[PDB]
Amino acid sequence: GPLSLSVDAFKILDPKWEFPRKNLVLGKTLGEGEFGKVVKATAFHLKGRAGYTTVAVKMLKENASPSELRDLLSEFNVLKQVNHPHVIKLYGACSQDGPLLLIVEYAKYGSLRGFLRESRRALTMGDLISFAWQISQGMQYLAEMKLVHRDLAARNILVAEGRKMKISDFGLSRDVYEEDSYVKRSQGRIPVKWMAIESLFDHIYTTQSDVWSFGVLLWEIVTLGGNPYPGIPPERLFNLLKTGHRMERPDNCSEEMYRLMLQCWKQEPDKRPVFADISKDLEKMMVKR
Amino acid sequence: GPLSLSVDAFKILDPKWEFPRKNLVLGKTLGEGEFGKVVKATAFHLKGRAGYTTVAVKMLKENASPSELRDLLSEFNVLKQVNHPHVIKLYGACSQDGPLLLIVEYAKYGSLRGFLRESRRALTMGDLISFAWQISQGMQYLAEMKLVHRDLAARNILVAEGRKMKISDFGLSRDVYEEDSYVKRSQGRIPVKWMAIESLFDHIYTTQSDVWSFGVLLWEIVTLGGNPYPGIPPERLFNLLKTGHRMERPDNCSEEMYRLMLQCWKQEPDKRPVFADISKDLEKMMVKR
Ligand SMILES: COc1cc2c(Nc3ccc(Br)cc3F)ncnc2cc1OCC1CCN(C)CC1
Numbered sequence: 417g418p419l420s421l422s423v424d425a426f427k428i429l430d431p432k433w434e435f436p437r438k439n440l441v442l443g444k445t446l447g448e449g450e451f452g453k454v455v456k457a458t459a460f461h462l463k464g465r466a467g468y469t470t471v472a473v474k475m476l477k478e479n480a481s482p483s484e485l486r487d488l489l490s491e492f493n494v495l496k497q498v499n500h501p502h503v504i505k506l507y508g509a510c511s512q513d514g515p516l517l518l519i520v521e522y523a524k525y526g527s528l529r530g531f532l533r534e535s536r537r538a539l540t541m542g543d544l545i546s547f548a549w550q551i552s553q554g555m556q557y558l559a560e561m562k563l564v565h566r567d568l569a570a571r572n573i574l575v576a577e578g579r580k581m582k583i584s585d586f587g588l589s590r591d592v593y594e595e596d597s598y599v600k601r602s603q604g605r606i607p608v609k610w611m612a613i614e615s616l617f618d619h620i621y622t623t624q625s626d627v628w629s630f631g632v633l634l635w636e637i638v639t640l641g642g643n644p645y646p647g648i649p650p651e652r653l654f655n656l657l658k659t660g661h662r663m664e665r666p667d668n669c670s671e672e673m674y675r676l677m678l679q680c681w682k683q684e685p686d687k688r689p690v691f692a693d694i695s696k697d698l699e700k701m702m703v704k705r
Numbered sequence: 706g707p708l709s710l711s712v713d714a715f716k717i718l719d720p721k722w723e724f725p726r727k728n729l730v731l732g733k734t735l736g737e738g739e740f741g742k743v744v745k746a747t748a749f750h751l752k753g754r755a756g757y758t759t760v761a762v763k764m765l766k767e768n769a770s771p772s773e774l775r776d777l778l779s780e781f782n783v784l785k786q787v788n789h790p791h792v793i794k795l796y797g798a799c800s801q802d803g804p805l806l807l808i809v810e811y812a813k814y815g816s817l818r819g820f821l822r823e824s825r826r827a828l829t830m831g832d833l834i835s836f837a838w839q840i841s842q843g844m845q846y847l848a849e850m851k852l853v854h855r856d857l858a859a860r861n862i863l864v865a866e867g868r869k870m871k872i873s874d875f876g877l878s879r880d881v882y883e884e885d886s887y888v889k890r891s892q893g894r895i896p897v898k899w900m901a902i903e904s905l906f907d908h909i910y911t912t913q914s915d916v917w918s919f920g921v922l923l924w925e926i927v928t929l930g931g932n933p934y935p936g937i938p939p940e941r942l943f944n945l946l947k948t949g950h951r952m953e954r955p956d957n958c959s960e961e962m963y964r965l966m967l968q969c970w971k972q973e974p975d976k977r978p979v980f981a982d983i984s985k986d987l988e989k990m991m992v993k994r
């Protein structure tokens with residue numbers, strides 16, 4: 417099937433991306449998600465860097481399904497193609513003898529959500545706008561490469577040295593060069609509370625559904641890692657969204673910030689802003705403060 | 706889409722299966738898997754039982770995707786239809802106001818794998834054959850109801866009072882009344898090392914692929930909860946199975962037991978035994994010992 421073909425094609429291919437397993441040393445587990453497991457690691461003589469370099473490594477969990485393996489392969493295939501100061505940087509993979517291991521630049525502070533939840537440490541509204549803005553700039557880049565990310569969320573953004581946002585977790589990202597949508601017949605593996613209404617109901621994913629997600633991400637940022645639609649079970653989200661409900665304005669959120677959230681959550685995809693207008697909106701808020 | 710329809714139809718339906726949330730009290734987490742989370746619980750005045758009854762409750766994890774929600778709904782829909790001494794028994798669900806909670810009879814010893822791994826406690830080969838036989842009897846029942854379970858594995862069998870096997874985790878089970886196969890276009894969420902070769906390569910699932918899985922389950926039983934294809938990365942399983950390799954005979958396994966494993970792992974589905982012959986094979990081994 418499609419996977420066996422990919423596995424075979426792969427297992428027979430770019431020396432630019434091959435790293436020798438014997439120069440990688442694995443360490444403590446940093447995180448496990450629905451698709452893969454990340455460890456801290458160190459790499460010897462990585463891409464012309466002398467000595468060891470501290471890195472992070474993603475790999476399959478115990479008892480991986482074909483689905484999770486398609487996702488790892490595909491994340492690897494997307495990571496090879498993207499370069500941006502605000503997208504996670506790929507160094508290579510070990511693929512030969514042993515499990516597939518993707519090697520990326522280590523992000524000092526880990527996930528944005530963890531970073532926010534551990535805060536009050538003391539962050540200003542200008543910091544929060546700055547964080548959102550860096551992501552929007554990463555997103556406008558991905559939108560111009562004709563990728564839909566699909567999994568935008570505070571847990572899938574990393575925070576590197578000097579509080580730099582790196583967009584992460586490219587396993588669910590799809591190419592939309594041809595038709596400007598990605599459509600998935602069976603049910604998605606993205607959490608329901610981050611999904612655009614037309615992704616929920618109609619399985620349509622676009623840059624405008626990434627915008628919806630960013631809307632939710634903004635709320636996570638503003639609430640310092642709060643839980644979206646708190647107390648509300650995911651199954652209730654069908655009826656809640658279709659009848660035109662959205663999340664209340666949270667505490668410590670301007671009216672201008674909240675209106676941006678709402679414009680990202682418009683029922684009609686075309687009424688939402690594109691990432692370039694989002695970046696302009698955020699620059700304008702930063703400067704006014 | 707299909708899910709929004711199911712959610713709406715559901716959220717408007719059988720009093721036989723409704724349990725009042727206010728008579729359920731939830732307790733410690735027993736387990737989390739790829740699809741749901743199980744807690745220990747107690748239920749007051751459950752289905753005509755006086756006082757409290759100790760039960761287990763399955764629910765969605767944090768940040769459930771549509772996929773996991775389809776799975777919970779569907780597990781519930783299958784559990785309503787099956788009754789067998791060796792299939793987990795369903796008591797009801799809380800579905801009204803609050804998250805969906807499926808309530809099942811509590812299995813004293815938890816998962817078969819955990820049960821085996823904690824053993825030497827002292828189990829005989831006759832115990833192991835007995836365990837396999839009870840499962841095969843459950844499976845022959847499910848095969849006659851025209852279900853393919855798809856997720857057969859030691860981790861998805863529970864051990865109740867008096868060492869009784871309960872087949873569990875019906876989220877991936879499909880109806881095959883019409884065509885005797887279930888075919889899935891996108892990639893499956895069942896671990897690769899339990900999957901029949903035609904499920905791996907061609908996305909075809911039948912009773913004969915459940916047999917393949919039982920083959921693997923037998924190995925887990927015989928090795929007392931060993932890890933299938935140990936040391937081998939899942940991605941290597943395509944080429945390893947297609948070139949006709951299977952797992953070696955493990956220690957403490959008769960030649961007759963091993964030949965059954967191999968007959969379950971035949972390349973051609975039709976050469977494998979049906980669950981009735983499996984049960985006969987196992988009865989015959991029990992009696993000869
Ligand atoms: C789950 O946590 C991390 C994931 C990382 C991560 N994840 C990741 C995402 C996609 C891919 Br491909 C590979 C990865 F390693 N990449 C780089 N640096 C990371 C760094 C991470 O955390 C670093 C923190 C640093 C602070 N202490 C409190 C805990 C660990």
Ligand SMILES: COc1cc2c(Nc3ccc(Br)cc3F)ncnc2cc1OCC1CCN(C)CC1
Binds near residue numbers: 780812813
């Ligand atoms: C993950 O562990 C369990 C799962 C159970 C379980 N899981 C389950 C499967 C499908 C559905 Br629907 C609902 C469920 F609760 N059902 C009934 N009893 C269970 C009992 C379980 O474990 C009981 C053990 C008992 C022994 N101690 C060491 C730990 C807990």
